[PDB]
Design a protein around this ligand. Structure first.
Ligand code: FES
Ligand SMILES: [K+]
Ligand SMILES: [K+]
Ligand SMILES: [K+]
Ligand SMILES: [K+]
Ligand SMILES: [Mg+2]
Ligand SMILES: [Zn+2]
Lengths: 77, 168, 86, 54, 295, 193, 53, 119
RNA sequence: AUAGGUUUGGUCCUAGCCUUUCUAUUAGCUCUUAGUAAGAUUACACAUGCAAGCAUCCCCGUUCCAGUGAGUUCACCCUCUAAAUCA
């Protein structure tokens, strides 16, 4: 793919993209679907983040992890 | 034949038979042994036979050996906390020394089993990829799935050369 | 080669000769038969009651070529080539 | 409501662990707030066009 | 109240274990596989008896009987019906959760049909998918043709019943219809042609006995045991029959007559056993021969 | 030539002619490849018969036209399998051309699949530690309220005709670049009669 | 392991950063638009068709 | 190397041979080549119907969740696969495309009806 | 390597060279179809065309992908802590 330095093509100098036609009925319905869709997915993401954060803490400072550490220290002594 | 006395010591099979995998605390192991005297025979055999096995299982632990510095042989372990574990080995056999250090500073058999199970999970049977990493390279190997075109030519209708010709 | 081959094969000790010399059972372990302890020879005379001393480390001379092969260190383009039935 | 597969897995996990509840798992969307796409964004973190003049 | 023993009850396990027997030569028959040079050890008689004992321990692990399970009930559960997707896709999608550390019977495998119904995968699809992604040694995705009737009769003609059972155990799950069908077709052929010795000292004998007792056709096996001088096993077979059919003529007969040892066979032979006449003749012959050796 | 045994290939191996030619030795016992050097080429010739013409030194299978490689000719197939280990001999072992070795390998597997050729079937362990069918994955999941009531899982799957005011906003914003408005879609997929 | 110091790479980097602060394009230059063609002269890029009106 | 910015994404890496597509679901850096270095393989997607008439999709759901919880984005084709599985809600564009197809097919039936009725 | 040929009038020992095996380019002669894979000798010089846009203006992107093997112990581990993603 081109780099910022490569010169622009002559053929494309006058290319003016014509935007798509909008259907009033389909546009509004689709816009709400996206809003509802992305609210649901953002809630799901917030639950998967908390799970990941809980597992890390549980391994670092969880009851079972801290119990094993003390057991190992005792057995050493 | 292989050079040296007891050439078995210089074989990967023998070097992997060591049962002493030190805990992560152990950093330095010093072996002070005497070259002569019957009371130090075990230490001499432990240096002759077992240090290669210990080092093979604990590559990052520094093992340093000192000859005829003290009247009696002893081991000293320097732990990461700064604690020093002195193990007197005089009159003990090389097997007894090997078992003693396993008990006091060696990982138990349970701890080692767990580590091996963690390694198992790294390779997933379902993952498709090169043979070095994965069992199968492509789904086409699975029987029932569409076979690789290299081995079985695909139907003409499923080939893009003719999906365009039929259309135009 | 010929004189050497006949010298070695003539001097090979049979399982029975071993049992008689050692006064112990010779037990063959086969991988295809699992743990089954099949006995190939027994001492015709009296059977010793003391177990042969098990030396922790065998003081045996190893051939480098064997050990090197066992460790997958021997690459030969001529080894294990397909050949006609002999 | 949780999407079909997720709900089935959560419910199955309850029964596997021994939890018997007739309530259906429900995501909480009260924390999530869907702003309009035309809501003014932060102008302090926005970049600027570079100096190359034509 | 009074529960009839299950196949895995310690009592049943002990009876069926003893009935099977332990021939070390058959259990550890030399396998036709890639071979390696055998190793040799110089062993005393004490050491030889210890190794033979260890072989008996290993053989008893190899003979552990598979648990007999009841036919699994077809899965027909619909998770959702998205009718909007009807007609959009022409082929169904099978989604397999391949999370490593999940028991295979606790994995969610769902199918999106072209109609839009998200349904749980059938037992057959579940087994096929687990093979696709967690391939097990000896199992095939497409059912091997050996299990067709014409091909199973050939295996039976060659007295390769244990082979048929080892093939079935690898291909099909213990509660599947195909597993259940094949095992029961094999057991019938063993009964019809009196080939009970084929399955002795194998892990499949108990299952065959369990089949015979619960369908009331222990006559052929009893005859064989007597003809082979295995009365202890024959008496235990009749005893077990009574425990699994307590409200039966033979069980009541033994109760009424307090029959023990050989008597149990006679009581069962007349009342319930279909081949009462043949059993008595076979048992008669044995008892006469035994009386001679005693002299 | 036309061998009379194609229909019943096993008969040739029990005929007198076979016993006179081969006896009790395998059909390939006497074949010797002609090649330069002491180490033979690691592949055998591709085919001994090209365009219905046989080459100079035909392989054990191709030199006798009455030997038919068929999954039913179990005695012929057995000669090409190791009796002690059960592995199919590679072609350089017996000297069969690649074409006939491929046919032999396929016929041996077909005989093994049909039960005509005995092979070591190992005893395998069970797939699962627990054989319980109580988990939700295999059991019945309690039906969701929408599934019981007949509603879509989420309310926004169904088409809801937008309010007229909102359609005016879109008609103002996209003046001159507007499509024909779309009524609610059919409730189910139509089909060509 | 001793990396050979690259001193021109640091000189130019500083010089560039400075010139970007002294010869910075002003808001007048960046956001000017030619209403006849509806293109920004500084960048020479046409504005979106939907933004022309 | 060290890509300037970027993010992890769960996307479909195309494998197979000519006319035999096969996709591997992988969590890879946004900027990496489609078929290049990836952080973890999270499943596979065979788009060709097999002998049983199935399109097989494997989803390591335990690990897909872990990576979504670490900030991994999703490609549109991947989001649509999770929608069909029931892990996520149906992507709006499958619903809209399904409705567009319904309208198209309804308009075609009317033309076909005229063919047989008028003529 | 399962080894083989070759020193001499001949033998044994040592020893080099070479043969037989499997690949990759190139040359000669030669060639029917189908599927699939792979595909300048040179970091030598390059005509022509194309390869980065999107978008209600700002931003973002063009720092990626694709290419090459000139240089060459910056690639791996630990510590440490930027940018970046989790709206
Ligand atoms: S390698 Fe699988 S399609 Fe070719
Ligand atoms: K030589
Ligand atoms: K050529
Ligand atoms: K933009
Ligand atoms: K280079
Ligand atoms: Mg930061
Ligand atoms: Zn041939």
């Amino acid at each position: 793919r081109k780099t910022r330095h490569d010169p622009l093509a002559k053929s494309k100098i006058e290319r003016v993209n014509m935007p798509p036609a909008v259907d009033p009925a389909e546009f509004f319905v689709l816009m709400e679907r996206y809003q509802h869709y992305r609210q649901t997915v953002r809630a799901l993401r917030m639950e998967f983040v908390s799970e990941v954060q809980r597992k890390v803490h549980e391994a670092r400072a969880g009851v079972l992890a801290e119990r094993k550490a003390l057991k190992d220290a005792a057995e050493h002594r | 034949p292989m050079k040296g006395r007891f050439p078995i010591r210089r074989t990967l099979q023998y070097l992997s038979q060591g049962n002493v995998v030190f805990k992560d605390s152990v950093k330095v192991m010093t072996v002070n042994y005497n070259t002569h005297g019957e009371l130090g025979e075990g230490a001499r055999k432990f240096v002759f036979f077992n240090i290669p096995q210990i080092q093979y299982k604990n590559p990052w632990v520094q093992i340093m050996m000192f000859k005829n510095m003290t009247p009696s042989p002893f081991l000293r372990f320097y732990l990461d906390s700064g604690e020093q574990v002195l193990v007197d080995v005089e009159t003990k056999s090389n097997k007894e020394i090997m078992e003693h250090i396993r008990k006091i500073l060696g990982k138990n058999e349970e701890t080692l089993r767990e580590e091996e199970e963690e390694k198992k999970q790294l390779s997933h049977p379902a993952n498709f990829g090169p043979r070095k990493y994965c069992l199968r390279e492509c789904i086409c190997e699975v029987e029932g799935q569409v076979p690789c075109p290299s081995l079985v030519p695909l139907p003409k209708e499923m080939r893009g050369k003719y999906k365009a010709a039929l259309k135009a | 080669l010929t004189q050497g081959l006949f010298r070695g094969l003539s001097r090979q000790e049979t399982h029975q000769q071993l049992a008689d010399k050692k006064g112990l059972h010779v037990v063959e372990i086969r991988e295809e038969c699992g743990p089954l302890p099949i006995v190939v020879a027994s001492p015709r005379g009296p059977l010793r009651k003391d177990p042969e001393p098990e030396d922790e480390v065998p003081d045996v001379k190893l051939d480098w070529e064997d050990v090197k092969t066992a460790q997958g260190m021997k690459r030969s383009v001529w080894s294990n080539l397909k050949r006609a039935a002999t | 409501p949780y999407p079909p597969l997720l709900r089935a897995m959560i419910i199955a996990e309850r029964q596997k662990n021994g939890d018997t509840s007739t309530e259906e798992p429900m995501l909480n969307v009260q924390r999530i707030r869907m702003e309009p796409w035309d809501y003014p964004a932060k102008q302090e973190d926005k970049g600027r066009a570079k100096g190359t003049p034509v | 109240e009074t529960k009839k023993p299950t196949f895995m009850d310690e009592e049943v396990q002990s009876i069926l274990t003893k009935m099977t027997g332990l021939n070390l030569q058959k259990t550890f028959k030399p396998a036709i596989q890639e071979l390696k040079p055998p190793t040799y050890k110089l062993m005393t008689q004490a050491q030889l008896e210890e190794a033979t004992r260890q072989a008996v321990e290993a053989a008893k692990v190899r003979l552990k009987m598979p648990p007999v399970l009841e036919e699994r009930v077809p899965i027909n559960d619909v998770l959702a019906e998205d009718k909007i997707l009807e007609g959009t896709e022409t082929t169904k999608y099978v989604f397999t959760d391949i999370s490593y550390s999940i028991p295979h019977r606790e994995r969610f495998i769902v199918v999106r049909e072209p109609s839009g119904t998200l349904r749980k995968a059938s037992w057959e699809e579940r087994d096929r998918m687990i093979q696709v992604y967690f391939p097990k040694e000896g199992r095939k995705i497409l059912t091997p043709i050996i299990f067709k009737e014409e091909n199973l009769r050939t295996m039976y003609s060659q007295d390769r019943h244990v082979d048929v059972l080892n093939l079935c155990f690898a291909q099909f799950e213990p509660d599947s219809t195909e597993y259940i069908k094949v095992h029961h077709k094999t057991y019938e052929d063993i009964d019809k042609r009196g080939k009970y010795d084929l399955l002795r000292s194998t892990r499949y004998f108990g299952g065959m006995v369990w089949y015979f007792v619960n369908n009331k056709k222990i006559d052929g096996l009893l005859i064989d045991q007597i003809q082979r001088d295995l009365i202890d096993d024959a008496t235990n077979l009749v005893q077990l029959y009574h425990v699994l059919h307590p409200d039966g003529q033979s069980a009541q007969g033994a109760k009424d007559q307090a029959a023990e040892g050989i008597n149990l066979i006679k009581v069962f032979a007349k009342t319930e056993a279909q081949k009462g006449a043949y059993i008595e003749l076979t048992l008669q012959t044995y008892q006469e021969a035994l009386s001679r050796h005693s002299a | 030539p036309i061998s009379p045994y194609k229909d019943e290939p096993w008969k040739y191996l029990e005929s007198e002619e076979y016993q006179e030619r081969y006896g009790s030795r395998p059909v390939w016992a006497d074949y010797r490849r002609n090649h330069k050097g002491g180490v033979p080429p690691q592949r055998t010739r591709k085919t001994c018969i090209r365009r219905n013409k046989v080459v100079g030194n035909p392989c054990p299978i191709c030199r006798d036209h009455k030997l038919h490689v068929d999954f039913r000719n179990v005695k012929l197939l057995e000669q090409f399998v190791c009796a002690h280990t059960g592995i199919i001999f590679y072609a350089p072992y017996t000297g069969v051309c690649v074409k006939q070795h491929k046919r032999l390998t396929q016929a041996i597997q077909k005989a093994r699949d049909h039960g005509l050729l005995i092979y070591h079937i190992p005893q395998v362990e069970p797939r699962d530690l627990d054989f319980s069918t109580s988990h939700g994955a295999v059991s019945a999941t309690p039906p969701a309220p929408t599934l019981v009531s007949g509603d879509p899982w989420y309310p926004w799957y169904n088409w809801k005709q937008p309010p007229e005011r909102e359609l005016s906003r879109l008609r103002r914003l996209y003046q001159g670049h507007l499509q024909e408005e779309s009524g609610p879609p059919p409730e189910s997929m139509p089909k060509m009669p | 392991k001793k990396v050979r110091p690259r001193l021109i790479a640091e000189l130019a980097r500083r010089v560039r950063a400075l010139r970007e602060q002294l010869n910075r394009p002003r808001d007048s230059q960046l956001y000017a638009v030619d209403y006849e063609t509806l293109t920004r002269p500084f960048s020479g890029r046409r504005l979106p068709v939907r933004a022309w009106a | 190397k060290a890509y300037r910015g970027g993010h992890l994404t769960i996307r479909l890496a195309l494998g197979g041979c000519t006319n035999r597509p096969f996709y591997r679901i992988v969590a890879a850096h946004n900027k990496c080549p489609r078929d290049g270095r990836f952080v973890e393989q999270l499943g596979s997607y065979d788009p060709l119907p097999n002998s049983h008439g199935e399109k097989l999709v494997a989803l390591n759901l335990d690990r897909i969740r872990h990576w979504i919880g670490c900030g991994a984005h999703l490609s549109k084709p991947m989001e649509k696969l999770l929608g069909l599985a029931g892990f996520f809600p149906l992507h709006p564009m499958m619903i809209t495309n399904a409705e567009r197809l319904r309208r198209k097919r309804a308009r075609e039936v009317l033309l076909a009806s005229q063919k047989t009725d008028a003529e």
